[PDB]
Structures are given as C-alpha cells and as structure tokens.
C-alpha cells in the first residue's frame, strides 16, 4: 500500500507500507497428476471449447422457406460481451449484442 500527498501534485509519496497478506489455499497436484480434495483424489479433464476470434458462419437455408441463405458473422471474445452481424431476408444488416 502506497500513500500519496493530496496537496502536492499528482505523483508523490508521503509514506509507503507493505506486509505479507495471506489469501487462499490452492490445491496442489500429486506426482501422478491427480489432486486430493477430501481423501477422494479426483482428476480434472481438459475441455474442447470453441476458440475466441471471428467466425463467418451461415445457415443452410432453414429460414424464410425461400431457399435464400443468410450469412452471419460473430465476434467471440475471450472475456466480455460478444457481437453479431446478420442479414435479414430483405438484405438489411443487423447488429446484435449478447443475443
């Protein structure tokens, strides 16, 4: 923790203090690769989730019964709010946020 001085310009030190604060307990991993939680050693499997980035997907003509496709483009962030652009059957361009 560092304390500035109010009257002095932005950027200055009146006095700075620090200490070793405890926080949390992270379980460790045995030699084999299995955690022990409550005498019931468990394992964590990996996940196969779709990657962040951009995807230009489309629907295979399963809407409007007109045989007309509708391309759409999605931006998927790693942490935040998504974003989508879509084409209405009338060739408009619609944004859509978090559905």
């Amino acid at each position: 923790l560092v304390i500035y001085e109010r009257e002095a310009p932005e950027g200055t030190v009146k006095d700075i203090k620090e200490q070793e604060v405890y926080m949390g307990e992270i379980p460790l991993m045995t030699d084999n690769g299995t955690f022990v939680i409550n005498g019931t050693e468990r394992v964590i499997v990996s996940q196969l989730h779709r990657s962040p980035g951009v995807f230009f997907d489309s629907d295979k003509g399963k809407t409007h019964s007109s045989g007309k496709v509708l391309y759409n483009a999605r931006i998927i962030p790693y942490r935040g709010s998504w974003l989508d652009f879509e084409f209405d059957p009338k060739d408009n361009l619609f944004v859509r946020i978090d559905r």
Binding site: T40, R42, S46
Partner: protein, 49 residues
C-alpha cells in the same frame, strides 16, 4: 478460497477418478470433454457435433 475450492471440489470438470486399473487412470487423465461451463449441453446437442 471459496471461488477456487468450489471449482476444484464440485464442478462439471473435476470428477472422481475411477481407479480399478492402470489403464483406467491413464485413459481418464487424457480425456477431452466438450461439456462444462462454456461448452454445449449433453442432451440438446445436435448430430453434426
């Protein structure tokens, strides 16, 4: 502590390790699931997946 312990102890991806073989352990540590938080649900997943 709560935020980490709840994940490690009770999640959809920290599962009890069946241990009735060497092979079961080895093939369970290499599993590649697609369910869980951020994935697709078990019972409403299409066929193309």
């Amino acid at each position: 502590s709560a935020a980490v312990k709840e994940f490690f102890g009770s999640s959809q991806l920290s599962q009890f390790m069946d241990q009735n073989n060497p092979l079961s352990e080895i093939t369970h540590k290499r599993r590649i699931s697609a369910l869980g938080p951020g994935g697709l649900t078990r019972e409403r997943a299409g066929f193309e997946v």
